Amino acid sequence: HVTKRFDNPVLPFNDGVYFASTEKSNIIRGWIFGTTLDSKTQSL
């Protein structure tokens, strides 16, 4: 909060990705993966 630090940009997924999370309050909720993110393609 402090800046409000709303960090959540689109990032590439080249050949597999390592995600590490430090949490204390169950704040990260999920993940989305795909190509265009506009229902033109199939996304998960």
Swiss-Prot record:
Changing residue 22 to I: In strain: Iota/B.1.526, Mu/B.1.621, B.1.1.318, Omicron/BA.1. Changing residue 10 to A: In strain: Omicron/XBB.1.5, Omicron/EG.5.1. Attaches the virion to the cell membrane by interacting with host receptor, initiating the infection. The major receptor is host ACE2. When S2/S2' has been cleaved, binding to the receptor triggers direct fusion at the cell membrane. When S2/S2' has not been cleaved, binding to the receptor results in internalization of the virus by endocytosis using host TFRC and GRM2 and leading to fusion of the virion membrane with the host endosomal membrane. Alternatively, may use NRP1/NRP2 and integrin as entry receptors. Binds to host ACE2. RBD also interacts with the N-linked glycan on 'Asn-90' of ACE2. Cleavage of S generates a polybasic C-terminal sequence on S1 that binds to host Neuropilin-1 (NRP1) and Neuropilin-2 (NRP2) receptors. Interacts with host integrin alpha-5/beta-1 (ITGA5:ITGB1) and with ACE2 in complex with integrin alpha-5/beta-1 (ITGA5:ITGB1). May interact via cytoplasmic c-terminus with M protein. May interact (via N-terminus) with host bilirubin and biliverdin, thereby preventing antibody binding to the SARS-CoV-2 spike NTD via an allosteric mechanism. This is Spike protein S1. It comes from Severe acute respiratory syndrome coronavirus 2 (2019-nCoV). The gene is S.
